[PDB]
């Protein structure tokens, strides 16, 4: 049994860059897509792109374009999100999960290409393994 | 991303009571790949159902899902005090997949 | 098959080299090969590929049968078999197998017969 | 081992049991081991196929043979195959083994998969042709072509007889395998088996021009 | 001694194998030998053991005298000595030195005389 | 190095400087290297003997020859011998060496002792016969028979020419080696030199049946 | 050049050893060579020094053409070329190429012709 | 590769294409690989010369040939050279390599320097003669004579056929 | 010079199992017979079975049958006595000692044969090196 | 097990005094393998004598043993403050070996 674990809670200033971390703790993250959520108070789980240390493609959520970096070192057991331009709306409990425990090209779907232009593909699957949460408190 | 909502949003139930939760996607979910998961406030979520109805690993018989297209449900038999959690849905049949806002199950 | 052969061999020539024979005074690894392109004259190029495929099965059967990791010995061993096949340390002059050419020997024999 | 003999510019095959007295071998300088590529037989040389042509088995002693001459390859492979945890799948090239330097294109492949214990080897027994060495085993990060070998007696006559592609593997052949063609960490091509090395370069130039994470051909 | 011999040898035959010739599609190590049992015909079995023991001394003196760890080429070298012993690049026939049999050449001398 | 020759199933031996015009060698396929065991020669094959007939010396290089055919062994050894502090006694076998797979019984021996520096060699020079390989040195955790190697010329004719016993060692020959035969990790029997591989099996089965730290045969 | 040679060689003499043939009963290091001192009769040794320097060029050009790392089979290969040179196919009896001595066949041929 | 041939104490050199019907090779025991030293040829055998004779180059596959007999060496060298950063410069001698057995003096040298990538080797192509082994490479802590290798044919006849210095590199 | 070191004093409850450890401290215990004693107050040295880390067999004392495990890991420098079912009679200072630093046949003694029945044999020699002791206080 | 006793059991001696200690086994000791060793309270014991009379390594001449069969003694000359130890015997001439109850040497 692998227990995904988040770092503890912390208080951050607006505009800062928060490195949100998850440790595999009883496994590694090597080739699996580690999906993330933002459980802002009163909200559901807002999704962020999957991290694959040994990546081909990793994703980025549309609502976090330019805001969240999805990244990990190859063959590591620590996965990270980099949340830039932090706002009080981002105060949330963050969680990691294994959302497709093998990012083969099978997990690569998307809108079709146009003649002369191409759309990229990515598809994550069931978040079967979920970790503990970290509360990021954000001032403003 | 994909829009998803949940309903009724609140279920006032007695332990041991059977009740049904509903989730609705703005789009049909391919292969009926909708997940259900639950957490009580202060807890990390746990996957209950995947594939609209199939039970996730380690999940008791009390949890049984159903549905097709964009329309899915979870029926919980003999609901226990430990199950008065906020239930959430997530679409995996499409991409980007998406989460709903949750349905709260609480003791009557 | 492909009748167009782009081939290479080793620059194993002797009188090609002056003082560059010293292995640390030249490429000594990548720049020591030749190349060229040839047509399938007489069907040789595709014929060789078929030979090579037939040889490959025979060879792996011969390789599993040994302990040596690296075969360098095949050219020498076969040269030895070539002489042994022609002459396995035994010879019959009148046997067609000893690979003897007595055609001018005959002339020296008849020159003696006629004295 | 049958021995081919070149005679009157014709390749004849001398069964070992048959005696040909006209064949004259004056020196071992006439004896050459030739490495030939599996290209000259009209078969597919792409990555998905090459992966299908590879597999693993333990309990097999390793084997290497040398050679002196050979064919140029349109395509070679350079493999650095790892397990999901980063450990090696392939043996290290032993001292004396060097990657084959005569390839127009080299399909350098990495990525991860389960790598069942054993040596990676060729499915039809083709030899991996390394620089002047051939074996039945794939070695780490070492370039090779796939091929066959032949041994000839040559006549006493004076005849004398790049682009790196980078791919991302997916479990190395476990029924379902897909590859990506990588240009950069942000730039990929979904790899479809019907496309050539030239195609991949041309598509790389197109994507490169148009801002560059993984894209399709869209014919 | 034990007059009998229980022996094994390598399956070094030719086309004895179908598709299992590929080393990774068969035993390729333990199941690639043959075996049998023979009696002491002509005293051969115990005779061979003594030869092998006399050979062992000769062989290890050789090994001590060389630098090659794996002298697997020793038997090809022995084949070379067979050939050199039998014909050291020079062929004499009146003595049994090249082991050529000219004796029935008498018939070909007679035929030349009569042409 | 003499060469045996087989003529009408009769051994003849051809000396290096003796010319035999009846020795017909059409190819090297007639040339064989044969490993024979030190069993048919009438000597003791037990574990105590094997220890006594072995010794060590440093500064003596390793030597290896191969063979294609040979005898089956009644008694093989597989030794994993350690110094008192756990350091290895025996050298690692080099790549390509495999334990000899043709043994009715394998005397697998472990235990500890001083292991004088050097390589372990046979007292009268017998070879350690590994799978298709003969060498002067005993290698760690590798099965071998002990024997001699013959070379010979065969006529062109169509003749075509398990149980592990676990023991624990005591000081490797320091004027006594009390070996115990292991029945289980908690059951050991005094090894007596007249107890053959077969008797050891019977002793193991009998005491196991009867409930089994040291015991003696008491015959 | 130096006409006074102190040389050493391998103790490769066959019947030189009694029971010390055993790998660890002999010196196995320094006491396995023989040696001596000789005058350079006819300037032979100085001639060999020149040969060895010329040979080194030919040899390294050869070595650079192969993959074998530690060889010795190279001298056996010279024995093979000797045998192939001399009898690489057929024997031309009266040819300068076979190095067969048919000349004293005259004794036996003449005896037959004279009958 | 030419072969020297000894004829009643006279030398002739046999070319590959030179046919001599007079040369009889009854056994491979008549063939020798001989390691000759770079000494009797009148060259300097001193310390700075030996160093000048040595240099480095990468991209060269290593090569070894054996030998059976050789000349006594008055001047052998033994190098155990480290890099400027303290790590080993020279390659380890491979299995089977021991230094030259017959030396009057051994010019053993240690010390450090920048160690250009490559093998230390002879400028003239001379061989490093080790115990019955000749190579194109200098190995750690191993004694060698400097020399050349001849191959030859001998007649069938019964002719049969230390001080340590301690230097530092800069 | 090797000087064996025993652990220090401890207080234990009856019914407990006390694993008493000794370090070789300037040696190892590898193939050596490490004997133990129990110096209960008012008593002499009560003998316990010798431990061989790299064992064939180890010995046992009769008074401790079913009470004391005689054991050490192969090639280690720590030796242990596991004193189960602890009673007030076990309140004692325990010591480790080296005697016969090579289990071998001189170390293999015991009752004579009774054909049809077998005897195990073990013996230890003069104890030259004694370690420090541990007082195990046992409640009641 | 094997029974062993010691006597007198107490010796009140002056420093510098010569005295003899005795040990008795219930059985004869093979090869006269009786050991003598001593400890003061708080000390690990040290072997003095082995083999009935032979001195153990690093042991001064003041300690000399004797005896045969089951009957053994130790003579201590010039007793020093360091030697007012409790002396014990152990039998290595049988198996399992055994220990005596000790003889106490104390200052007068
Ligand atoms: C020497 O020359 C001979 C021909 O004379 C070659 O032998 C055959 O070559 C053909 C290709 O021309 C091989 O055919 C292909 O084999 C692939 C591998 O299959 C292996 O694994 C399966 C189990 O999964 C086994 O049943 C099979 O025997 C093999 O061990 C198949 O995957 C191929 O099928 C696919 O492609 C074809 C188009 O080419 C489609 O029609 C199919 O639907 C499918 O998508 C195909 O069958 C054939 O296997 C070779 N062997 C034999 C005995 O016929 C030798 O290979 C060549 N020597 C060397 C060293 O290459
Ligand atoms: C090739 O074939 C020959 C025979 O033609 C074998 O040579 C002899 O074989 C006999 C056995 O048949 C050997 O005899 C025995 O030698 C033992 C070893 O002696 C040496 O080592 C010990 C220990 O270090 C030294 O003390 C001793 O001085 C020697 O240096 C002896 O220990 C044997 O004696 C014991 O056993 C016999 C019963 O066999 C009892 O009668 C004795 O009382 C005693 O308990 C015995 O003497 C003989 O030594 C071998 N050599 C020679 C020159 O005769 C070759 O071994 C065989 N080679 C191979 C590779 O198989
Ligand atoms: C086989 O035998 C032949 C001779 O028949 C030898 O071949 C050449 O021999 C000459 C004479 O010994 C060598 O010449 C010497 O080279 C030294 C090294 O110079 C290097 O560095 C300079 C730059 O500083 C470069 O220009 C040069 O090319 C080299 O890379 C010089 O230092 C020597 O100079 C001294 O001696 C000469 C007289 O010989 C004086 O005139 C000078 O003033 C000075 O005192 C000299 O020039 C030549 O290098 C050898 N050839 C090769 C390829 O090395 C073979 O060496 C020999 N082979 C073997 C294996 O033994
Ligand atoms: C894809 O095309 C680009 C553009 O030609 C290649 O990048 C250039 O490579 C050459 C070397 O061959 C360098 O000198 C240039 O500086 C590179 N230009 C860049 C990065 O802008 C690129 O290597 C090609 N492909 C792949 C598959 O990696
Ligand atoms: C000693 O006896 C035991 C008990 O029968 C043998 O161990 C069994 O071996 C078989 C395989 O042949 C296994 O299937 C059993 O599970 C084993 N049993 C146990 C308890 O381990 C053992 O091989 C015998 N050893 C000998 C004759 O050396
Ligand atoms: C491949 O498919 C077969 C059925 O044809 C199945 O038994 C096997 O387990 C599959 N292997 C993998 C790696 O999916
Ligand atoms: C073996 O016994 C001899 C006396 O015969 C003795 O000198 C030698 O030291 C003893 N060796 C060992 C290892 O005990």
Numbering used by the authors:
A (entry chain G), I (entry chain H): 1 to 140
B (entry chain I), J (entry chain J): 1 to 108
C (entry chain E), E (entry chain F), G (entry chain D): 511 to 625
D (entry chain B), F (entry chain C): 33 to 193, 215 to 265, 273 to 279
H (entry chain A): 33 to 193, 215 to 223
From the publication, what sentences describe this entry?
To determine the structural basis of neutralization and synergy behind glycan cap antibody-based enhancement of base-region-binding antibodies, we solved eight structures of glycan cap antibodies in complex with mucin deleted (ΔMuc) EBOV GP (Makona) and BDBV GPΔMuc.
The resolutions achieved for glycan cap antibody cryo-EM structures ranged from 3.3–4.4 Å for six of our complexes; however, preferred orientation, sub-stoichiometric antibody fragment (Fab) binding, and trimer instability resulted in limited resolution for BDBV-329- and EBOV-237-bound structures. We did, however, model BDBV-329, where resolutions ranged from 4–5 Å at the antibody binding interface. EBOV-237 and BDBV-329 are unique among the antibodies we examined here because of very long CDRH3 loops at 25 or 33 amino acids, respectively. Furthermore, several of these antibodies have exceptionally long CDRH3 loops, such as the 33-amino-acid loop of BDBV-329. BDBV-329 and EBOV-237 are monospecific for the autologous viruses BDBV and EBOV, respectively. In addition to differences in the size and shape of glycan cap antibody epitope footprints, the number of contacts associated with residues also varies for each antibody, with some antibodies relying more heavily on less conserved GP residues, such as BDBV-329, and others having very few non-conserved contacts, such as EBOV-293. BDBV-329 and EBOV-237 make extensive contacts across the GP, including several non-conserved residues, which likely render them single species specific. Conversely, EBOV-293, EBOV-289, BDBV-329, and BDBV-43 only partially contact this pocket and also exhibit lower or no trimer instability. Antibodies that did not synergize with base-region-binding antibodies displayed little to no destabilization, such as 13C6, BDBV-43, BDBV-329, and BDBV-289.
